[PDB]
Amino acid sequence: ASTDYWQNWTDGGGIVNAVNGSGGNYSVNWSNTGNFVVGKGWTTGSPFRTINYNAGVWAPNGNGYLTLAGWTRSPLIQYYVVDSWGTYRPTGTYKGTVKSDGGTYDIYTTTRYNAPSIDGDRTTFTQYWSVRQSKRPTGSNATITFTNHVNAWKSHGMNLGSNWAYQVMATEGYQSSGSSNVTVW
Numbered sequence: 772a773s774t775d776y777w778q779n780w781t782d783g784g785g786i787v788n789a790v791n792g793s794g795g796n797y798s799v800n801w802s803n804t805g806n807f808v809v810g811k812g813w814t815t816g817s818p819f820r821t822i823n824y825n826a827g828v829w830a831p832n833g834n835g836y837l838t839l840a841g842w843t844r845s846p847l848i849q850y851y852v853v854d855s856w857g858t859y860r861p862t863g864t865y866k867g868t869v870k871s872d873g874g875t876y877d878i879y880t881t882t883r884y885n886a887p888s889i890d891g892d893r894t895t896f897t898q899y900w901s902v903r904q905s906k907r908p909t910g911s912n913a914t915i916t917f918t919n920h921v922n923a924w925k926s927h928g929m930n931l932g933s934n935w936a937y938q939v940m941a942t943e944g945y946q947s948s949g950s951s952n953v954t955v956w
């Protein structure tokens with residue numbers, strides 16, 4: 772299924788100029804920001820989805836992630852499959868590794884307290900991460916075979932909730948400027 776969801780959230784810090792392009796394409800040009808997440812994908816995520824993308828521009832200046840991002844409820848969990856980043860490689864409690872789509876990813880868990888989520892501005896939730904051990908080349912078609920991540924997570928005691936919310940291929944940034952241009956399908 773082609774994309775049906777446009778994610779465009781900023782906490783209000785700095786400038787986040789997001790463009791909802793044709794089909795699965797979008798761009799972001801951002802300046803001196805707080806936290807934001809822009810991307811395209813699906814209203815209802817699936818553990819079985821294969822996400823395709825092509826980042827024709829990946830140019831963070833500071834902390835930016837080029838990442839699958841999505842949520843479940845019951846329980847409320849944020850997950851990531853981070854393919855590239857800027858000045859900061861996100862880490863947490865180390866769980867293990869998974870190989871998928873030509874890369875090796877470290878698996879991490881973190882917790883957020885009093886943080887923004889799909890449920891409110893001040894919420895507490897767990898985050899599940901796969902973070903590639905090196906930045907993935909950009910500019911060619913790429914796949915994220917999410918099932919591989921879900922299955923590895925499960926094997927390390929990281930179960931997702933039962934009620935699936937959005938699932939996008941995102942540009943997330945914090946305290947940074949940059950440019951990105953990504954097509955998702």
Ligand SMILES: [Zn+2]
Pocket residue numbers: 867868923926927
């Ligand atoms: Zn393992």
